[PDB]
Design a protein around this ligand. Structure first.
Ligand SMILES: Oc1ccccc1-c1ccno1
Ligand SMILES: Oc1ccccc1-c1ccno1
Lengths: 210, 214
């Protein structure tokens, strides 16, 4: 798989690309490349955004700049991923789907957004996915890109209910004992205990899942 | 001011918190972010932070001893201890607003399969603890979730409906025109078109926000 990320903060994505198992680059299973959006600016001031039509605060990212960047980086086989607060939800099922893609391009924009014509144009010749990673507001798409890259790549070979509490040694620590059932050697009972713990925690923390 | 401490076995991975939205806040002195290598609190020759799970199962669980010593040093009774976990309460914008007024956040970055539950339990006897999920997908570790939480919280520090499409110059591009209403300068018609766009988009992409089935 090849992942290209386009961003005005290239340094942001550098630790996740040097994260990968050398054995998976050398085997050609994966490659992550980060591109500075300012490579495709037209002016000496390297402008990437401009005032929104119709008024309002902030700035909107320029279609001419983004258009040139995606023209260079994308092909007809590309899945173009655009993080946005107004996106469809990114889920584990999404990550599974994208994990079998040959080429992901992630376009990182600011909160106010990329001119809509960029995605609209791109969608006439490639698959485009606008996605949100949760219901909170980030200043830009970079952190969302990190989350997406991590969730997708750990599903690439070689790279419900909530889970209940886990425990390891020592059996007693600061007055708290590991639940004795976990040391019982009754593995049917352990499974049933864990199921009840999951039920209780899901009720408490994520009743939406029920 | 706000202090954020992050504890992790991958301190270099938290470097994206620099020269950025959080970087700007740091350099403006509105926040101090310190990153701590958890292995600093081991005494093992191999600096071991994990062990096999009691009761069975795949993978490893982070040892409570190391975490206990780390949090003993870093946290006070006033600390909000944040623990990213797939089994957490949802971290939302409301959460971000709430934490934006905290004096001290400590974020404990764990492995996916998790930190021994007694760490959070012990911490809760002397400080507030919040175990949170940032979304329904699986990360390998808490580090990316820490970066998301830091960014969401810091932009709110002093110092419904989906957003519809936005546009900027030029008014025609590749034969695609900006919707004429946006060029018209009529605040009322612009407000109405934008509301209608947001409605179509929320219904299509996030029907849950308006109280419909997914
Ligand atoms: O807040 C954002 C700004 C830009 C791009 C994406 C986001 C976002 C927020 C939540 N998920 O994605
Ligand atoms: O998958 C994870 C692993 C470790 C810590 C946190 C997470 C997580 C996933 C979603 N929200 O948080």
């Amino acid at each position: 798989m090849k992942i290209d990320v386009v961003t005005i903060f290239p340094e942001y994505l550098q630790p996740v690309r040097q994260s990968l198992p050398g054995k998976a680059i050398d085997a050609g299973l994966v490659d992550v490349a980060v591109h500075d959006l300012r490579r495709w600016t037209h002016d000496v001031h390297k402008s990437v955004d401009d005032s929104p039509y119709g008024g309002g605060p902030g700035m909107v990212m320029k279609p001419t700049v983004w258009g040139d960047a995606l023209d260079e980086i994308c092909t007809s086989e590309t899945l173009l991923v655009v993080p946005t607060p107004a996106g469809y939800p990114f889920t584990q099922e999404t990550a599974w789907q994208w994990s079998t893609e040959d080429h992901l391009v992630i376009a990182c924009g600011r909160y106010e957004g990329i001119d809509q014509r960029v995605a609209d144009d791109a969608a006439t010749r490639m698959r485009v996915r606008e996605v949100s990673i949760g219901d909170y507001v980030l200043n830009g798409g970079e952190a969302a890109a990190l989350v997406i890259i991590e969730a997708v790549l750990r599903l690439v070979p070689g790279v419900s209910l909530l889970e209940g509490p886990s425990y390891t040694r020592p059996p007693s620590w600061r007055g708290m004992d590991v639940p004795p059932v976990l040391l019982s050697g009754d593995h049917a009972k352990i499974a049933a205990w864990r199921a009840e713990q999951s039920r209780q925690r899901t009720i408490e923390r994520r009743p939406d899942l029920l």
